C-alpha cells in the first residue's frame with residue numbers, strides 16, 4: 319500500500335538560485351547541498367532540488383496545469399503572498415482560484431501555490447459550490 | 456510560514472484512464488470526481504487530477520527529472536512493483552541509490568517513484584558517504 323508522498327523532486331537549471339528561492343524566500347529548511355542538488359524540508363515534505371541540464375526556464379503559457387501547493391495558515395497567508403509580490407516573484411494565471419490561494423512561479427517556471435485549507439475543508443466547501451458534474455464518494 | 460505540501464496537482468489528458476491508474480492500480484482513495492477532474496488521497500497526500508487539453512503524453516526522454524515519489528514499506532515494495540509490471544507500466548530509470556526505488560510512468564508520462572526511506576535515512580547515508588561537494592546544515 320502507498321501512503322504519502324515520500325518526496326518531491328524538482329529539476330532545476332541553476333542550483334544556487336533555486337536553493338535561495340526555496341530556503342531564503344519561501345523559508346524552507348536546508349539540510350544539505352552538493353554539486354548537483356539539495357535536500358530541503360517544509361514541515362513533513364522532503365523536497366529535492368536536482369540540477370538537470372535538461373531543465374528549461376518555462377513560461378507558464380508553455381506548461382500544463384501540473385502544480386505544487388504549499389500549506390499556510392489563514393493568519394499568515396495574505397502577508398506571505400504580499401511579500402512574494404513585492405519581491406517581484408512571477409505569477410501564473412488560472413480561470414479560477416482554488417479557494418484561498420496565491421499562484422506563483424519558481425525560477426525555472428515550476429508552478430507553485432500557497433493554499434489555506436485541507437482536502438476535507440475543500441470537499442465540504444465544494445458540496446455547497448460544486449464543480450460541474452461533481453460526485454462525492 | 457509554510458507548513459508542508461498542501462496538494463499535488465497533475466494535469467491529465469484523459470480523466471478516466473488517469474482515475475483508473477491512481478485509484479484502481481495504485482490503490483489511492485477517490486473522494487470526488489467532476490467533469491474535468493478528481494480529488495484523491497494517498498495517506499496524507501491530497502492529489503488532484505485536472506483534465507487539461509494542454510497535457511501531452513510525454514516520453515520520458517522528453518521530460519526533465521522532476522518526479523513524484525510515493526512511500527511504501529520495504530515489506531510491500533516487491534509485490535507492488537510486480538503489480539505495476541503485470542499491468543505493463545513502463546519504467547523510466549533503474550535504482551542506483553540508497554533505499555529501494557522503482558521508477559515508473561503514469562499514463563501521461565508523469566515521472567513517478569516508489570521509495571522506501573525517509574529524509575533522515577538519506578541524510579544518514581550521505582553523512583557516511585557524502586556526495587561530491589556535499590555540505591550539511
Ligand SMILES: *Sc1ncccc1C(=N)N
Nearest residue numbers: 414440443444447448449
Ligand atoms: S469545488 C469549490 N469549492 C469551493 C468554492 C468553489 C469551488 C468550485 N470552483 N466549484
Ligand SMILES: [Mn+2]
Nearest residue numbers: 387416431464
Ligand atoms: Mn492547486
Ligand SMILES: [Mn+2]
Nearest residue numbers: 327522524568
Ligand atoms: Mn526520487
